[PDB]
Write a protein that binds this ligand. Sequence first.
Ligand SMILES: O=C(O)CCON=C1c2ccccc2-c2ccccc21
Ligand SMILES: O=C(O)CCON=C1c2ccccc2-c2ccccc21
Lengths: 115, 112, 112, 115
Amino acid sequence: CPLMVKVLDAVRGSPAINVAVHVFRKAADDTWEPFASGKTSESGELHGLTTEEEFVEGIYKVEIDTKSYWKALGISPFHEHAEVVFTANDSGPRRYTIAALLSPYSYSTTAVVTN
Amino acid sequence: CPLMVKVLDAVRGSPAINVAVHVFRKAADDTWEPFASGKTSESGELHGLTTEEEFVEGIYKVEIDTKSYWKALGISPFHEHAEVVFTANDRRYTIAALLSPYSYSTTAVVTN
Amino acid sequence: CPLMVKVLDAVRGSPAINVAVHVFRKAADDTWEPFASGKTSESGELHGLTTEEEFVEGIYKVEIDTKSYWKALGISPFHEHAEVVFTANDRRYTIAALLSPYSYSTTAVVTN
Amino acid sequence: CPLMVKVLDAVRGSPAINVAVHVFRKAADDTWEPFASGKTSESGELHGLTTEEEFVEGIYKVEIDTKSYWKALGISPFHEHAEVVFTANDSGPRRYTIAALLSPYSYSTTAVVTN
Ligand SMILES: O=C(O)CCON=C1c2ccccc2-c2ccccc21
Ligand SMILES: O=C(O)CCON=C1c2ccccc2-c2ccccc21
């Protein structure tokens, strides 16, 4: 699995479950084409977005729908979503984990990239 | 000054200086219209982006050119940039970003 | 003002006000001697902890009473406190802390 | 495994490997008794510190030896170590993961607690 997303909730100290994630790839004409989407599981993970074959070099945007997450918990958060944008596979295939840690007015995101 | 940006460098423990920041407002057609831009000062801050008159309710995007920052330091970064997207609803907004090569955090400090 | 503390609340997007902070210096016997303390202001800051004369090289601990902060808000936190331990080596040190109930980050901004 | 530690390196975007971790428990006489120790693996994880039986209620300190980590990489970091202090198991047994994300002048730590 070359692209995985892991999301944690900093208020509850738990996985962030049922978080919607939309992945896009920057096209030849410079716009963002839909690439993959899904929702985090009970462990706050999202696997199976793509395949090695499909996940070619390019600029990708991983959009994490943080607002919908907080709103469903009664919280009115600051951000609309958390967007993570990166060049992938430009030195050959790598495995990427995009981790996000969420609070209503703050988030962090870290990439763990392995070869 | 209704909107301020503060950027920090977590490798060096310092303000991130000369970091380009572009702000956009979302238009009725769902595109991002350029709104404000500048480069962070010696204190890692960018003030004077707007005025209260100009900064009406709406969805804004603040794009922080983190890639160029790291490149200038000779360090290979992960992200193309850091994007911060939020609705301005009617005080003073401080968007802060703490930068590392493969990680960043962003926090909104909203005050009167 | 060689040592400043800044505390932020990541749930509310605000300075963390009235947060008690205790600073200690490590003594020759490896114990922590009380050094400075105060409570954060309305801007989440604590200034005037020391002077340059007093703030000699050595290992310091800054303890931030995060548990009491959350309790006062009716929120159940994880940590007993946030501890920040570092060697002062000879400028101006700003210890910043971003607080959430089950998470915190701390950053040193060291400048001239 | 009721207590696990996971450490990531924010400069390299990788697990933080061979990080020394020392765990202490606050004693009856108010001092910190050694409780467990170990080092993170190639995945940046440390399992097997304790057992359910041994990990009774108490105040614990997880000390992460961040300085030694950075120094071994040629970096002179700000902090001596990252200390995480918490009451454990005071509402019955829980599983705790103490995650730390490291940069030379900054770190964050998050607890994920499951029942
Ligand atoms: O600061 C950020 O955004 C990153 C902070 O996330 N911490 C991460 C974390 C926390 C608890 C349990 C597992 C993981 C994990 C696994 C793989 C990759 C990253 C992380
Ligand atoms: O980790 C994050 O995203 C938050 C970390 O930022 N720390 C902040 C910080 C650090 C040093 C000096 C001044 C400030 C500041 C001012 C206004 C608002 C936020 C912050």
